[PDB]
Structures are given as structure tokens and as C-alpha cells.
Amino acid sequence: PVGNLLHTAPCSFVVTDAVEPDQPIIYVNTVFEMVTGYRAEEVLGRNCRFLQCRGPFAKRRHPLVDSMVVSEIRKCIDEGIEFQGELLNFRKDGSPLMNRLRLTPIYGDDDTITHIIGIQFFIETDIDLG
Amino acid sequence: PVGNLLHTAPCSFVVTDAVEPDQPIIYVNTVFEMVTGYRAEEVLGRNCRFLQCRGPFAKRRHPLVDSMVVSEIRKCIDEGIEFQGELLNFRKDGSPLMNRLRLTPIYGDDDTITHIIGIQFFIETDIDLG
Numbered sequence: 411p412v413g414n415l416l417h418t419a420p421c422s423f424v425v426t427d428a429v430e431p432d433q434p435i436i437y438v439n440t441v442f443e444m445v446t447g448y449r450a451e452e453v454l455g456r457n458c459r460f461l462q463c464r465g466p467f468a469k470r471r472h473p474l475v476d477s478m479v480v481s482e483i484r485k486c487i488d489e490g491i492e493f494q495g496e497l498l499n500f501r502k503d504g505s506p507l508m509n510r511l512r513l514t515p516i517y518g519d520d521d522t523i524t525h526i527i528g529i530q531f532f533i534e535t536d537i538d539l540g
Numbered sequence: 541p542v543g544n545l546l547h548t549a550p551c552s553f554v555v556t557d558a559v560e561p562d563q564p565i566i567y568v569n570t571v572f573e574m575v576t577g578y579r580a581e582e583v584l585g586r587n588c589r590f591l592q593c594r595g596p597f598a599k600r601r602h603p604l605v606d607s608m609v610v611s612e613i614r615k616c617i618d619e620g621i622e623f624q625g626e627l628l629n630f631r632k633d634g635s636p637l638m639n640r641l642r643l644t645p646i647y648g649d650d651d652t653i654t655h656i657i658g659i660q661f662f663i664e665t666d667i668d669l670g
């Protein structure tokens with residue numbers, strides 16, 4: 411009873427297209443797939459904010475994610491700068507995760523931001539959701 | 541007493557320009573800087589292979605780096621796919637690290653690959669070096 415171990419440190423990557431509108435996800439590693447429960451077909455082409463919604467079925471972002479941080483992310487993207495912050499997020503199966511997220515934008519060959527990398531650190535949280 | 545901790549999990553990664561010749565480094569995160577000993581300005585614009593020479597002065601790759609694995613890396617970068625292996629690397633203070641390495645190419649708005657994401661997982665190793 412000691413198996414199916416990971417061979418590398420679990421790091422969670424997601425990359426988006428900064429040219430096409432609204433930063434669609436173009437890649438996710440299988441650690442994101444493993445922690446959030448979302449396989450990659452489900453999320454490819456969508457925008458990450460679906461993580462702020464509790465469950466695949468939830469229509470609206472959950473009350474409890476700090477709308478002030480969500481706005482910092484927005485501000486940071488629109489200025490093409492790094493973002494660093496913590497916010498609530500939800501697995502497919504509803505579980506809550508505090509996500510320490512870092513967003514670094516990547517430049518293309520014309521002094522323009524063509525992609526954005528997001529590194530997720532998903533911490534378990536005992537938050538009460540009601 | 542305990543402090544100076546880091547707030548996220550230590551994930552090491554770099555991004556290279558896949559358009560410009562020979563995959564120059566355009567981004568390193570600070571985990572890379574902190575595990576390898578090389579600072580961002582020392583490595584920006586250079587190719588990652590300096591990690592296979594032992595130290596910042598050696599200009600030739602170290603004998604015990606597996607020439608076969610380096611070759612497979614070359615094949616995958618060329619074939620436009622993902623590499624996934626383990627490869628002897630060296631900190632700038634000379635110490636050996638088994639670098640469990642993953643290369644993941646990223647397509648631009650185009651059908652061409654414009655960037656590669658490299659995720660290092662450095663491991664301590666008592667490999668005898670002479």
C-alpha cells in the first residue's frame with residue numbers, strides 16, 4: 411500500500427492566449443487536471459474564472475470569493491503586468507481550495523504579450539460555505 | 541527558530557523563445573534562481589544548456605551528463621513535441637543535481653510554436669564526479 415506516486419513535485423500550470431479575446435486556456439498540465447478535477451477538454455478554450463464558480467453547474471461566481479482580488483487580477487492583465495494573490499476556487503466536485511495564484515505574462519516577437527502563464531498553488535481550506 | 545519560508549510550492553520553470561534561434565531564455569522564475577544559483581540577468585538570452593557544464597566557467601558539458609538524453613531533448617524540440625526525462629545538471633556552486641525535466645511547447649496565434657515552457661525538478665545526488 412504505497413503506490414501511484416508522483417515523480418515530480420506537483421506544480422499547477424495553465425497557459426492562455428493573450429491575443430484572442432478574454433484569455434482562453436490553451437494548455438493545462440495534468441497536475442491542474444488532477445487537483446481541480448477538470449480534464450483538459452473541459453477547460454480548453456474557456457476562461458479560468460470558471461474556477462471561481464463552485465462546481466461545473468454553478469452559473470455565478472460564489473459569494474465568498476473576494477471580488478476585490480478578482481478585480482486586481484483584471485487590473486493586472488489589462489496593464490500587462492505580473493499578478494500575485496490568493497483567492498477562493500472550487501474543484502469540479504465542489505470542494506473549496508484557496509488558490510495562491512501567480513500570473514506572469516509572456517512576450518512574443520513583436521514586443522507584445524502573446525501568452526500568460528498561471529501557476530496555481532491550491533491549499534485546502536476549512537471555509538464554511540452554506 | 542523558523543522563518544524566511546516560501547509561500548508557494550517550489551516549482552522551477554523557464555520560458556524560451558521558440559522563434560529566435562536556439563531557444564534563448566526569456567523568463568526564469570525565482571525558484572530556478574534559488575535552486576540553481578543563477579540569477580535572472582545571468583541567464584536571460586542564453587540557452588539552458590549551460591546547466592550541463594559544471595559551474596559558471598566550464599565551457600564544456602560535463603562528461604557524466606548523458607549524451608543520449610541531451611540528444612532526445614534535441615529530437616523533441618525539433619519534432620515540436622514534449623520532452624520528459626532526467627539529466628545531470630549543476631548548480632553555479634558546482635554541486636550536482638539530477639534535473640527531472642519536462643519541456644512543453646506552446647503555440648502562438650498562428651499554427652507555429654512560439655515558446656517552450658521548461659519545468660525543472662532538481663534532486664540532490666551523491667553521484668561521484670572525481
Ligand SMILES: Cc1cc2nc3c(=O)[nH]c(=O)nc-3n(C[C@H](O)[C@H](O)[C@H](O)COP(=O)(O)O)c2cc1C
Binds near residue numbers: 481499509526530
Ligand atoms: C493564465 C491565467 C490563469 C488564471 N488562473 C486562474 C485561476 O486559476 N483561478 C482563478 O480564479 N482565476 C484565474 N485567472 C483569472 C480569471 O480569468 C479572472 O477572473 C480574470 O482574469 C479577471 O477577472 P474577471 O473575469 O472578473 O474579468 C487566470 C488568468 C490567467 C490569465
Ligand SMILES: Cc1cc2nc3c(=O)[nH]c(=O)nc-3n(C[C@H](O)[C@H](O)[C@H](O)COP(=O)(O)O)c2cc1C
Binds near residue numbers: 554589613
Ligand atoms: C525551455 C527549455 C528549458 C530547458 N531546461 C534545461 C535544463 O534545465 N537543463 C538542461 O540540461 N537542459 C535544459 N534544456 C535543454 C537545452 O536548452 C538544449 O535544448 C539541449 O541541451 C539539447 O540541445 P544541444 O544538444 O544543442 O545542447 C532546456 C531546453 C528548453 C527549450
